[PDB]
Amino acid sequence: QTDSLKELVNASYTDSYYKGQTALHIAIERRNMALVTLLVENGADVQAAAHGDFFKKTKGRPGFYFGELPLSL
Amino acid sequence: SKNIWKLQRAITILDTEKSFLKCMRKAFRSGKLLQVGYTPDGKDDYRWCFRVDEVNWTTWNTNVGIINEDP
Fold this sequence. Notes:
This is part of a larger assembly, with two copies of chain A.
Chain A: H1 5-9, H2 23-30, H3 33-41
Helix pairs in contact in A: 2-3
């Protein structure tokens, strides 16, 4: 009703450590199929590259590398 | 034999730690002081905690109980 759905849903983190993470990424990680459907139906981008520092492979330094893509995740 | 060696090294570590000045010992505590949660009184539960990292490829679903929702 605020005609802002596209920008809100496809909004993402800004700090370098989680840069690129999108609510679709959180939905897929939380394993909520219903939320995946709900988000994508409302215009969620399915090509969001979660290219943060956390989502890259670094020895010792904590993180999980999955391919930075919702399909890859 | 490996267990004996590890215990020998443990004794060495303890002796070395005990055999230095208080400045370095206080500068060399293990782990970090982290806000684990809340006491039943509701106050903050600060503890000296040691952090490990684990990987499980069978039971990821055990999402119950989590500090720091941000990784």
